[PDB]
Design a binder for this molecule. Structure first.
Ligand SMILES: Cc1cc2nc3c(=O)[nH]c(=O)nc-3n(C[C@H](O)[C@H](O)[C@H](O)COP(=O)(O)OP(=O)(O)OC[C@H]3O[C@@H](n4cnc5c(N)ncnc54)[C@H](O)[C@@H]3O)c2cc1C
Ligand SMILES: Cc1cc2nc3c(=O)[nH]c(=O)nc-3n(C[C@H](O)[C@H](O)[C@H](O)COP(=O)(O)OP(=O)(O)OC[C@H]3O[C@@H](n4cnc5c(N)ncnc54)[C@H](O)[C@@H]3O)c2cc1C
Ligand SMILES: Cc1cc2nc3c(=O)[nH]c(=O)nc-3n(C[C@H](O)[C@H](O)[C@H](O)CO)c2cc1C
Ligand SMILES: [Cl-]
Ligand SMILES: [Cl-]
Ligand SMILES: [Cl-]
Ligand SMILES: [Cl-]
Ligand SMILES: [Cl-]
Ligand SMILES: [Cl-]
Ligand SMILES: [Cl-]
Ligand SMILES: [Cl-]
Lengths: 450, 451
């Protein structure tokens, strides 16, 4: 006895929930399987708790650094990490309850268990067979641990959310946005923080002028950056502390070691090999522009397809797929070009489009012209801890089309979304120049460069 | 005895005058700028800048007094040194003055820190010396006014707010524009028992009512006490030095300070404008065409004195475009005063660009207008016991759903609008918004995910 559905979604993360709900909105009978907690990485171990801890860091900077220069004094300051975590978990628990009510309203069927393939169009969940002509693999990814002696004494970003107290000393190893974000939060919350990168600078894919501001501010306040660093081994002393040994002979003793050296897709444990789905050279599920796998009736959306590991990409791709399969939108698909990103570093980095380096590689040096503005954020300008801001435009051709917009500085996290619309619409430097500024804001520096 | 010739004389060293003088100098003009008070005008010394610094102080007060507890932070014996905040604020303004002097040196602008008075249409007297030029810009700005009632002298203007050295225990703010709403929110956050008096039904009457209703509801739950349909009849100074406002309906409200924020008037008196022939429009401002020309050839008026739109970026762009027209031969250069974005530093902050739903329905008819909204709680306040609402609204027109208005209220909205203002200037549609991928997690993503 096999139970039929119009759509089976494997994974209740950003990709699965979005695609499941949109499919249900268009009359499809949908089954969603989730082996862990609803909301996947974004809600339980990613964007959401990361942002809550980042706001905790912004409050920590107000109390320990800026409040004094605004005339506010106090004493017996104390920090209760368990209270911030309990409030963080209560908020996530309300997001879980909200998704469930949504499923009760739209009629999505959910099974909180592991889905395993039997063949290309049939899955087994809790000893019951389910079949559908449309199956979405939305299994996400997982953190990677290096093949280094003692690597098991360290934790990943999952481990960061399991901490119950600020470590006195923390080592963060990695050079991507997660390494930089977690290092900044631990530093703001009072941990002696050391960040280790293997090459010359962090965030290698982001505009160098922007990252250089971040590196300089880290050297003034932030975590201690160690460049050209390779961990040789990690030893756990009998006193429970960890000793990191670098290939160059240096060593650092810490209380916690966070590995943020990459993520890999969840491809094993669910008989993916019984479907015939093929992987690309990168090791992700191979898909076309419409998220079709190599097998008809099987789609792959989110981190598991390796295109862009961002929640809004997974959400939009999943909704556009449901539109295509169940609302007759044959040509519906996501444009993965010019997707804006915000890194909750200290200060915050916002970016959309090409770095100067990427524009030069795609259009040639003569065609590229950049505009930039450096200034101190008014918020920090009245204090003894002045923080720089840098906003940059990357333009190409005689009409100076804006192919990239990047910023670093206080409040940049909320500035990018509107500009990402203008760039999607083909904005030129003349469109920016014809827009009247909003004063006083940091965002106005984007439209007043000459 | 001798008249000194210049190519361009600029009366006033505020947002309009500095912008027009520097741009004219970059184009080779011999420029003279007169400033009778401080360089930077209202914006730098008594407007945008000191107002924003005090707004940041209010945000810090809200962190210490309301939100820190829910983020796990505790402390005792909190104290607030208003004089230290004010000292740091004025030191920042002193550095801004020096930046303007540095720019005049680089561009080659001649400046005199004295009051300019017209002798005739093409001649001014400054410090006893006559200067003449075929191009003269009046960029004199405006000033706050006091109501013509008994005891009005006991109140202070926004200028008096910046002169305060301590937070008043009780403050009355009379006014319904952005200045009254911003100063009431700052006083309330800094600990003053604040009362806001408006003559009509709601404040910010020109803004979308859906947005302002969220502001009014937030004030009722936590902010200043709003008094509607209030007319101040007189103010009495009590023997204990407190003040009592008498309303026309007979109500009495006792306070320590009373701020008048009932409107500004243009600076038209004291500089012999009556010797130029320049005429005023029926609104009482210097009359101008779309090119900032006064009724007298060779005299121009930019900024608050022309009454078109009292914002710093407007004064700056119009002053720059005027100099492009007079000294760079750009014959048709002029500022477009429509679709100018504004941010009101209320609690929570309001951002707005284009038409309100009511204004769109009036110009295009309900049949052609469709609005979209997103209602949510800012994540920053959502983990606390003091959840703050956010509301974002899109006003669309016709079959292509052209975005004619974009408005928001909520934590962080002040920095979200500039980019959308570019999209709306370029003629964005709901389809352009839908095709832009969101940035998560941010409040700004709610503007592109409405259905
Ligand atoms: C620390 C961190 C911070 C981040 N910050 C941001 C940010 O600020 N902004 C942003 O846009 N992105 C951010 N991301 C990325 C974002 O979280 C991911 O891109 C997004 O969650 C991917 O969604 P998904 O649906 O592809 O996968 P996931 O959210 O991982 O969902 C996959 C789900 O499938 C389940 N599953 C797997 N196999 C099975 C099976 N056989 N049966 C049933 N269920 C199964 C898993 O248990 C999991 O719940 C961050 C990520 C991390 C780790
Ligand atoms: C409390 C407050 C808050 C504000 N907040 C904002 C905001 O957040 N954003 C925004 O965009 N706008 C804001 N504004 C408005 C902004 O300050 C004005 O629109 C702007 O200053 C107008 O510039 P202006 O050049 O027309 O006039 P002003 O900046 O007022 O400049 C006029 C100058 O001319 C001088 N002057 C006058 N007559 C003579 C003479 N005969 N000879 C020599 N000098 C003379 C004066 O001394 C003065 O310095 C605010 C205003 C106030 C009062
Ligand atoms: C008769 C008269 C003389 C003035 N003289 C000066 C002056 O010498 N310096 C100055 O900065 N402002 C002067 N002002 C303007 C005034 O001080 C200030 O700009 C207020 O904004 C106007 O109410 C004068 C105004 C008038 C009416
Ligand atoms: Cl959804
Ligand atoms: Cl990177
Ligand atoms: Cl670069
Ligand atoms: Cl990583
Ligand atoms: Cl400064
Ligand atoms: Cl300028
Ligand atoms: Cl006063
Ligand atoms: Cl006013």
């Amino acid at each position: 006895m096999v139970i039929p559905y119009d759509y089976i979604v494997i994974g209740g993360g950003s990709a699965g929930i979005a695609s499941a709900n949109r499919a249900a909105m268009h009359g499809a009978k949908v089954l969603l399987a989730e082996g862990k907690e609803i909301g996947g990485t974004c809600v339980n171990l990613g964007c959401v708790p990361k942002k809550v801890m980042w706001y905790g860091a912004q409050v920590a900077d107000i109390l320990g650094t800026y409040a004094k220069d605004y005339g506010f004094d106090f004493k017996e300051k104390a920090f209760d990490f368990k209270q911030l975590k309990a409030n963080r978990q209560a908020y996530i628990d309300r997001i879980h309850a909200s998704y469930e009510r949504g499923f009760e309203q739209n009629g999505v069927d959910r099974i909180y268990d592991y889905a395993v393939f039997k063949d290309a169009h049939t899955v087994e969940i809790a000893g019951q067979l389910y079949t559908a002509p449309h199956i979405l693999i939305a299994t996400g990814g997982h953190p990677v641990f290096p093949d280094i002696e003692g690597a098991q004494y360290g934790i990943s970003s999952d481990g960061f959310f399991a901490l119950d107290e600020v470590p006195k000393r923390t080592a963060v190893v990695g050079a991507g946005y997660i390494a930089v974000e977690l290092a900044g939060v631990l530093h703001a919350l009072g941990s002696k923080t050391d960040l280790f990168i293997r090459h010359d600078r962090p965030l290698r894919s982001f505009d160098k002028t922007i990252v250089d501001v971040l590196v300089d501010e880290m050297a003034v306040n932030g975590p201690r950056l160690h460049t050209h660093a390779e961990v040789a081994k990690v030893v756990k002393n009998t006193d429970e502390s960890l000793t990191l040994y670098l290939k160059d002979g240096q060593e650092v003793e810490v209380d916690q070691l966070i590995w943020a050296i990459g993520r890999k897709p969840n491809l094993e444990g669910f008989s993916l090999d019984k479907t015939g789905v093929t992987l690309n050279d990168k090791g992700y599920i191979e898909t076309d522009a419409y998220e079709n796998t190599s097998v008809k009736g099987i789609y792959a959306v989110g981190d598991v397809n390796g295109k862009l590991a961002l929640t809004p990409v997974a959400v939009a791709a999943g909704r556009r797929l449901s539109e295509r399969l169940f609302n007759g939108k044959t040509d519906e698909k996501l444009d993965y070009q010019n997707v804006a990103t915000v890194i909750f570093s200290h200060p915050v980095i916002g970016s959309v489009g090409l770095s100067e380096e990427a524009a030069v590689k795609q259009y040639g040096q003569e065609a590229v012209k950049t505009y930039q503005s450096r200034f101190t954020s008014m918020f920090t300008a009245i204090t003894n801890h002045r923080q720089p801001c840098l906003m940059k435009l990357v333009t190409v051709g005689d009409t100076e089309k804006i192919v990239g917009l990047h910023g670093i500085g206080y409040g940049v996290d909320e500035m990018i979304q509107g500009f990402a619309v203008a760039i999607k619409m083909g904005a030129t430097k003349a469109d920016f120049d014809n827009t009247v500024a909003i004063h006083p804001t940091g965002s106005e520096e984007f439209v007043t460069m000459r």
